């Protein structure tokens, strides 16, 4: 008879897939009972069938995580590098502790800056910095904001910096925040489904199964629009192409189009959207440039794009919409450009297909009929990356899409943890909750208050930012305790204050110009994943040290290696001290990730890391204590801010994931009253929700959106009660999502002004008399129908944005702008104005970018399914699925080269080359572009010079160092490069 | 062998001498691979290789997304790619490959070996490993070129409908993988309402000749498939139209043993009684009279 | 038999004709057991006998604490226990005793009964005592002493490592129970890594010579010792110091075979050759001309 | 291949060992399910993993528990 089954006596646990989003729920298996004398070994792991989300499924990234975690790769002890040597030498914790500790304090007492030019205490050190891990838990990403601004470091930044930082940059000023706004169960309740600035069925392919739902069994359509036919171009109804670079010029053609035809919910436009405001008359728009332009600087002064205020210091309004001035009439004048001619010249997109695309979206401008719109990369990595999303988001509240079951923006998070980095700040001048550190220019916590405490914009509306100095005041107490009180305005001058953001182009501009010393990379690649390989690897030679943490030899920590063409580089030329040390992966610890759809989600421990490997939390704690200790008693500069921060933890040197995850859901630390004198909490408990949060120091919290996640109830995040009562796919009983458990958010919007649903078979909330109830928790206060109040309450106006105001860097409405490296050389929507005008190119990079007559071809890089960047590579089954590095042209390029399916070709750009395999192929097809005949060759990103699958080249060897004219998020999308037979 | 007392085949076994199969009364088992909602990832690669304990070599890209390029004795299913404009625009047909666990399997008919392979009651054509003695018959015999030798043992090897996890109440690895339910699971009668539930939905979008495919020529499959184009199977990288197990190995097989029979019989009882009835030829039978 | 498909040894088997090992892609498994840590509570013969459904007979006191004196076919571990003043000092050295379950083994290579001796791919080695016919080979090719013969049932028996518990995820029995900790059990890989670091703990408390035991000899094994003295493993009741197979063995179950296969296929033929080439030799050869 | 494991459809009951003040957990298994109909006989008994103290350990008193639940000396009638 068959092989017994082989799980029949193994430990069960619980865990959360580790590569990206989506979130799907693992049962892994171990052997060995839990008896203290059997060493668990994981050695098989499959998905969970009760989770939601995916229902057992897994991809080939989840399926195959036995060999990431049993990978031959995996880090077993300490490492050093010595300056010039090209040998690994092993040390012990306790060496480098004291080595690491060593060198961080003779910087920072070097460079440490405590007063600015200005005689502002700013307590900021910049000559070391750090990359933290977005593939690490929510506790992790705690211990190390504490570590890194304790320290003072303002170069701190996570993998938002390169990936969605445009988006929050562009749906916080259109939405009020910068979450996906959906989740994804609730996809399957779509009647169109728009694949667009993103490739879900191979990056997100478990979240994408709702897609497929929606297609199959809710007749939705599928529309895909890509300059490739991708994997899920394969399923889709509809699939047309789009040059890199012009999806602003395609939306924006949308808008038109919509408007021309008045496929729009007027309703939801007239009440919901500031349609009906009138703008300044100084505001305009001319020739490629809006006023306020200072071309000297290169940046806008954006006075003359906002509001007309009325008597009582409030946005004018016209609810007739005939006034020119209203954002209504703005827009249409904005958009009328773009028409189906002006598409097809710059997209390339064939007017029958761009047809095609308006009439199914049109159809969904009913109320009871939705789009949702997934996204990713193929949007935000473009210097007009924001623009691209603020596009898309108009559009779905011109459809009146917002806030309804299978509508939304489900702008799709990366990371397992993204989402949760970003909730926690880990990104240059930010605090925990979307909070920001305080810039040099506020001398005190009054003027800081004031500056992040928003005025409402229109009467009666929630506002709900009004609240900012309530969790401050509670961060700061999560930080300092006891340390901080009224007296000392809490600790205010313990933050490092900003002069400027360090984001990661910036600060390696800087290390190029050898203002850098030190730098940390944990959980992230930068020699794999960041812009302009060559120039990284130079930039990173000229460190006196770095540390990296990881459970995995990355390209990174091997930077001074010669690997031949893959990394020529000469050892003894390279002085950096490199320490590596090797820390536990998903599956070696408990704790909790933020999914796409803002689900914390806790997991557990299956069996201990190999080797002498350690959790990320000791490993920053013994760096943070060995330092500590060299202050306490040597002293140095900077001393106070980093003796006061607070690790409260039972065992310093190994917080555990309970305890950081209780700071961040936030505690009473003084019995609490409501305003009739009810008891709403007793000192010392656990906080129910950040409502509670107050800014006379008697509260504390680390994260206030996260306040409810663990309460006096419990551990929220492991809740697994996949109960959907409405049959929309909604589970209120699964794990617990921010804020407030509100699982798809902007939900007022549902209903129309009268709270009745816009489709009564789609209900999300109603009105019962006195409060809003249903399906979900309401994204709202109390306000009835009927009142002024609007359905965005985190917008000082209560409006999703049409007319973006002063938030964007260029230009309150969007505009097409060329990529740096472009095919045609213009913009042929206006000549005078090719690329965005506010995009920063320091001169070093300016001059290492090409043009078309030496690189003709359109440039872009992107994901396969079966693999997860260059982490992957490091496991056998997914090394066998896509064992060897490939390049993806037309048939008609090929031909022109006389390249042959599956010959070896040379990619190569102003900055580098690599040589692949060529994939030849008619998912890939030349555009009528301006006149021209424009080819794209595809990149893949998933190969480098350390794993199992064969040996290849970092892709960003190609890329341009450049970026999003707000985030500086990288133009990884749309590039120039040259091929030949190789 | 026959611990389960519900083999319905086997191979190399006498007709008059059936194999253990009084526990027979059980519902047949089948997997349904939807090819229009498959996405191409190979997740059930992964998976199938993961649960099996095994690992084929990292191959090369010869320009194409296939890889592994074929099943091998350490792939036991592979996902097959095929780009075409056969239908009037650019089709992407992606479809999963593998055993397709046939009702009348002709790896099990014509393979020599007796007990090699065995069809158990519930449909799933399963290797009993220790009676192979590699030859590679079984590789000729079968109509879907599923078979593959292990060059490490002299075995075959090749999908097992996850039997180990399927006789004690779970569904395969692959099937519970695959991210968007393309593939799916349960008894046979049941995934013959789903696949035709499946192609009714598909024919409503315009493909009117959406069909299942479970060849009667093979007394059909336990692994189905439902395709946009069934009237064309030969567009999913060579899936054959109308399979059977071939005339040449039918005969091989069937008339031509007993006929040899026959003629071994017939030609030993001739020459015993013809020696009996002449005598030998020896060099006088003359002078002994 | 090879129901597993993991089989990479098997005793009396040609090497052009191996055994079924397709699924051989799993860790390598190992029990460590620390004497250093060890209290010598018998606590491991005691749970070893329950798990397994055997019990030797009540037996006599000789003098010494060990009992059972021996491992038998109702004993598959024993404690040997010594008591020595060798190192300068009173020390009472104890260690848990049974099969090492070596990569390269030599029971298996001297049995002469295909499939009465195999070994996993997880580094175990077990009896198959369906085909075990009792010569006893294996009790001489054994370096440690371990198989042993049951009267009744003319079979040999030893630790199977549990392979019972291990196949479906659960540590061995004598792991779980053990009171101090002295036996641990994991991946070879993790284990080797504990023991270094458990010698690396003996060192600094003034062993100088403590150390692994895992001999190279036999290609290491899946039971291995952590020592405070592993410069003298006779110590600890005669376990053996480099050990390997004896070299009258491996000539005996090598070479010989090939030699003797030639000499036999050689005489077949000269003496064939011989006969037909120069004829019989009857009384006359003469007279017949 | 090996023999089953023998305690899969077992009934799983969590105890004490009996005999000195440690107090190591145990875990005990009887034939049968706990239907009326079957006569409960345990018939192993190993520790339990997630006991504090013994951590899945017994020592060979509490190992051979099970050689003392069914000692052939068990007392069965009350005798004068
Ligand atoms: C006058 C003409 C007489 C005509 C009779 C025709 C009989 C055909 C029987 C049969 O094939 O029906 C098969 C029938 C159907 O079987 P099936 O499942 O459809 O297919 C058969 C198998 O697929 C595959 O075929 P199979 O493997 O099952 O073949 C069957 C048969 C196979 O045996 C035979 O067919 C005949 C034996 C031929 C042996 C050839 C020896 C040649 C080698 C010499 C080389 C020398 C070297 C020089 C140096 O084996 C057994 O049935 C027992 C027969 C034992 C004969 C023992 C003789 C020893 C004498 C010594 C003194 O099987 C039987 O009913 C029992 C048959 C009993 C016959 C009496
Ligand atoms: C001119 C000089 C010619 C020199 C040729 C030397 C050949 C050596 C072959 C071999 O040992 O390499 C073994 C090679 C290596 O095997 P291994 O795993 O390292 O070790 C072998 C086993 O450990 C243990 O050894 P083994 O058990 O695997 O022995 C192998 C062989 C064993 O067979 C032999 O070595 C020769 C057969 C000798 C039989 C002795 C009969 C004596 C009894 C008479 C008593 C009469 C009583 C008076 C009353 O059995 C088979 O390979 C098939 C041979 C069948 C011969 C059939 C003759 C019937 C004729 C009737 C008309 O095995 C083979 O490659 C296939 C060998 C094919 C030879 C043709
Ligand atoms: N398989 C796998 N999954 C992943 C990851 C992985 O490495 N592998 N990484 C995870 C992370 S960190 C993230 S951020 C996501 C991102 O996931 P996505 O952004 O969906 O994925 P990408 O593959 O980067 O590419 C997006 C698509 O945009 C197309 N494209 C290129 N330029 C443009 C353009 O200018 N306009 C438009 N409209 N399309 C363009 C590309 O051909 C590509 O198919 O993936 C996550 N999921
Ligand atoms: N050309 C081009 N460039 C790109 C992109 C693109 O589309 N094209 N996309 C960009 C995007 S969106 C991203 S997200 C980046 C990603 O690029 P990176 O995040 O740098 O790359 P990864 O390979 O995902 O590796 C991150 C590390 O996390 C480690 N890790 C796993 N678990 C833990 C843990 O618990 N602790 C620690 N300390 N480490 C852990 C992994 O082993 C791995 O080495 O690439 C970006 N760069
Ligand atoms: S990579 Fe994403 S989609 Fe695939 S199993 Fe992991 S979480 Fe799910
Ligand atoms: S797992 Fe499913 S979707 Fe993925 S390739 Fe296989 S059958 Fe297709
Ligand atoms: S597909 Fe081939 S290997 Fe599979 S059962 Fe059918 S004939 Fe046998
Ligand atoms: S190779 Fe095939 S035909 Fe030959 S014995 Fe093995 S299973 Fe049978
Ligand atoms: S059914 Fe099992 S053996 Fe067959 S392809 Fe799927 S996972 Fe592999
Ligand atoms: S159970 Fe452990 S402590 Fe007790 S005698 Fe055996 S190995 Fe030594
Ligand atoms: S110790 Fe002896 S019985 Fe055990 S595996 Fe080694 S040679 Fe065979
Ligand atoms: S006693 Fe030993 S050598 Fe003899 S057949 Fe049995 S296992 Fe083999
Ligand atoms: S591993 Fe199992 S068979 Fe071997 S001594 Fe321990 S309890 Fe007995
Ligand atoms: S198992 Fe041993 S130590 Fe534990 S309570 Fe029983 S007698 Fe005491
Ligand atoms: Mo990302």
């Known amino acids: 008879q068959a092989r017994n089954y082989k799980l029949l006596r193994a430990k069960e646990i619980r865990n959360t897939c580790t590569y990206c989003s989506v979130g799907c729920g693992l049962l892994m298996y171990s052997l060995g009972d839990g008896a203290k004398n059997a060493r668990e070994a994981i050695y098989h792991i499959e998905g969970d069938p009760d989770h939601p989300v995916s229902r057992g499924a897994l991809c080939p990234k989840g399926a195959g995580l036995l060999d990431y975690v049993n990978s031959e790769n995996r880090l077993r002890y300490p490492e050093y590098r010595a300056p010039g040597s090209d040998k690994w030498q092993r040390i012990s914790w306790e060496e480098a502790f004291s080595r690491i500790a060593k060198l961080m304090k003779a910087d920072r007492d070097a460079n440490f800056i405590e007063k600015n030019e200005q005689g502002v205490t700013v307590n900021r050190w910049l000559s070391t910095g750090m990359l933290c891990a977005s593939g690490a838990s929510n506790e992790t990403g705690m211990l190390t904001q504490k570590f890194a601004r304790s320290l003072g470091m303002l170069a701190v930044d996570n993998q938002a910096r390169v990936x969605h930082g445009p988006t929050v940059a562009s749906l916080a000023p259109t939405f009020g925040r910068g979450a996906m706004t959906n989740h994804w169960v609730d996809i399957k309740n779509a009647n169109v489904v728009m694949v667009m600035g993103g490739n879900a069925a191979e990056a997100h392919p478990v979240g994408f199964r709702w897609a497929m739902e929606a297609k199959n069994n809710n007749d939705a359509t599928l529309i895909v629009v890509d300059p490739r036919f991708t994997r899920t171009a394969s399923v889709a109804d509809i699939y047309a192409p789009i040059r890199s670079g012009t999806d602003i010029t395609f939306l924006s053609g949308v808008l038109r189009y919509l408007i021309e035809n008045n496929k729009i919910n007027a309703e939801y436009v007239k009440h919901y959207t500031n349609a009906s405001l009138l703008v300044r008359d100084d505001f305009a728009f001319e020739d490629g440039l809006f006023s306020g332009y200072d071309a000297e600087k290169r940046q806008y002064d954006k006075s003359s794009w906002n509001y007309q205020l009325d008597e009582n210091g409030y946005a004018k309004r016209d609810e007739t919409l005939t006034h020119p001035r209203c954002v209504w009439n703005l827009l249409k004048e904005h958009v009328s450009r773009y028409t189906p001619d002006v598409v097809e010249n710059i997209c390339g997109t064939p007017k029958a297909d761009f047809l095609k695309v308006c009439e199914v979206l049109a159809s969904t401008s009913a109320p009871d009929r939705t789009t949702t719109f997934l996204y990713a990369l193929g949007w935000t990595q473009h210097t007009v990356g924001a623009q691209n999303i603020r596009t898309m988001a108009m559009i779905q509240l011109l459809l009146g899409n917002m806030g309804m079951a299978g509508g939304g923006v489900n702008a799709l998070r990366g990371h397992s943890n993204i989402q949760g980095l970003t909730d926690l700040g880990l990104l240059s001048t930010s605090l925990p909750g979307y909070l920001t550190l305080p810039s040099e220019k506020q001398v005190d916590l009054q003027s800081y208050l004031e500056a992040n405490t928003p005025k409402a914009t229109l009467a009666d509306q929630v506002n709900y930012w009004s609240n900012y100095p309530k969790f401050f005041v509670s961060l700061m107490k999560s930080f300092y305790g006891d340390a901080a009180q009224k007296e000392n305005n809490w600790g205010y001058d313990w933050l490092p204050k900003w002069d400027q953001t360090y984001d990661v182009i910036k600060y390696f501009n800087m290390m190029d110009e050898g203002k850098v010393t030190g730098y940390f990379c944990q959980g992230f690649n930068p020699v794999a994943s960041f812009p302009d390989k060559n120039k990284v690897v130079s930039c990173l030679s000229k460190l006196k040290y770095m540390v990296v943490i990881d459970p995995l030899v990355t390209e990174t920590s091997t930077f001074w290696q010669n690997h031949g063409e893959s990394n020529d580089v000469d050892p003894a030329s390279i002085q950096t001290e490199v320490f590596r040390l090797p820390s536990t992966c998903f599956a070696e610890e408990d704790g909790s990730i933020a999914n796409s759809g803002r689900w914390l989600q806790w997991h557990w421990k299956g069996q201990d890391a190999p080797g002498e490997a350690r959790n990320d939390g000791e490993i920053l704690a013994g760096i943070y204590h060995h330092l500590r200790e060299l202050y306490q008693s040597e002293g140095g500069k900077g001393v106070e801010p980093l003796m006061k921060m607070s690790w409260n933890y039972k065992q310093p040197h190994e917080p555990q994931s309970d305890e950081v995850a209780k700071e961040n859901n936030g505690y009473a630390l003084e019995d609490l009253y409501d305003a009739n004198g009810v008891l709403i909490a007793k000192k010392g408990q656990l906080l129910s929700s950040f409502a509670h949060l107050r800014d006379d120091g008697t509260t504390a919290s680390s994260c206030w959106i996260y306040t409810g996640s663990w309460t006096e109830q419990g551990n929220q995040m492991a809740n697994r009660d996949n109960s959907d009562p409405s049959g929309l796919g909604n589970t209120l009983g699964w794990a617990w999502a921010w804020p407030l458990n509100r699982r798809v958010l902007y939900n007022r919007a549902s209903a129309d002004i009268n709270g009745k649903p816009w489709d009564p078979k789609r209900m999300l909330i109603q009105w019962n008399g006195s409060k809003w109830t249903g399906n979900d928790i309401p994204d709202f206060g109390n306000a009835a129908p009927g009142t002024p109040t609007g359905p965005f309450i985190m917008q000082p106006e209560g409006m999703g944005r049409l007319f973006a105001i002063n938030k964007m860097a260029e230009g309150p409405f969007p505009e097409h702008y060329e990529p740096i490296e472009t095919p045609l050389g213009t913009n042929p929507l206006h000549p005078n104005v090719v690329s965005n005008p506010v995009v920063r190119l320091y001169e070093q990079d300016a001059l290492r970018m090409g043009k078309k007559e030496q690189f003709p071809y359109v440039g872009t890089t992107y994901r396969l399914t079966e693999h997860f960047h260059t982490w992957t590579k490091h496991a056998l089954l997914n090394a066998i699925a896509q064992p060897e590095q490939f390049v993806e042209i037309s048939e008609t390029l090929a031909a022109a080269k006389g390249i042959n399916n599956g010959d070896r070709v040379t990619v190569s750009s102003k900055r580098g080359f690599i040589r692949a395999v060529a994939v030849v192929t008619r998912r890939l097809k030349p555009l009528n572009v301006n006149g021209q005949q424009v080819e794209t060759v595809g990149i893949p990103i998933h190969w480098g010079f350390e794993g199992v699958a064969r040996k290849g080249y970092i892709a960003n060897t190609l890329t341009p160092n450049v970026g999003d004219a707000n985030s500086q998020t990288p133009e990884y999308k749309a590039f120039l490069v040259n091929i030949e037979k190789a | ?289």
């Open chain 2, 1 to 289: 062998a026959m611990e389960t007392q519900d083999i319905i085949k086997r191979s190399a076994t006498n007709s008059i001498t059936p194999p253990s199969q009084v526990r027979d009364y059980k519902a047949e088992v089948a997997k349904l691979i939807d090819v229009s909602t498959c996405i191409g990832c190979k997740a059930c690669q992964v998976a199938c290789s993961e649960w099996n304990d095994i690992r084929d070599e990292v191959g090369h890209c010869v320009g194409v997304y296939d890889n592994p390029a074929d099943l091998s004795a350490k792939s036991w299913t592979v996902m097959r790619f095929s780009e075409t404009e056969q239908n009037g625009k650019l089709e992407w047909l992606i479809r999963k490959d593998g055993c397709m666990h046939c009702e009348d399997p002709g790896c099990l008919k014509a393979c020599p070996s007796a007990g090699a392979i065995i069809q158990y009651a519930n449909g799933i054509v399963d290797f009993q490993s220790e009676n192979c003695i590699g030859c590679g018959y079984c590789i000729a015999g079968c109509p879907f070129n599923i078979p593959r030798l292990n060059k490490e043992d002299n075995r075959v090897y090749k999908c097992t409908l996850c039997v180990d996890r399927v006789s004690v109440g779970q569904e395969p690895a692959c099937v519970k993988t695959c991210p968007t339910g393309a593939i799916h699971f349960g008894t046979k009668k049941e995934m013959l309402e789903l696949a035709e539930q499946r192609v009714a939905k598909l024919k409503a979008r315009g493909y009117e000749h959406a069909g299942v495919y479970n060849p009667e020529g093979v007394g059909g499959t336990h692994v189905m498939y439902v395709l946009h184009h069934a009237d064309q199977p030969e567009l999913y990288h060579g899936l054959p139209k109308d399979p059977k197990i071939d005339t040449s190995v039918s005969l091989w097989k069937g008339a031509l043993k007993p006929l040899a029979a026959a003629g071994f019989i017939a030609t030993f009882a001739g020459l015993i009684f013809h020696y009996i009835g002449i005598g030998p030829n020896k060099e006088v039978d003359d002078d002994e009279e």
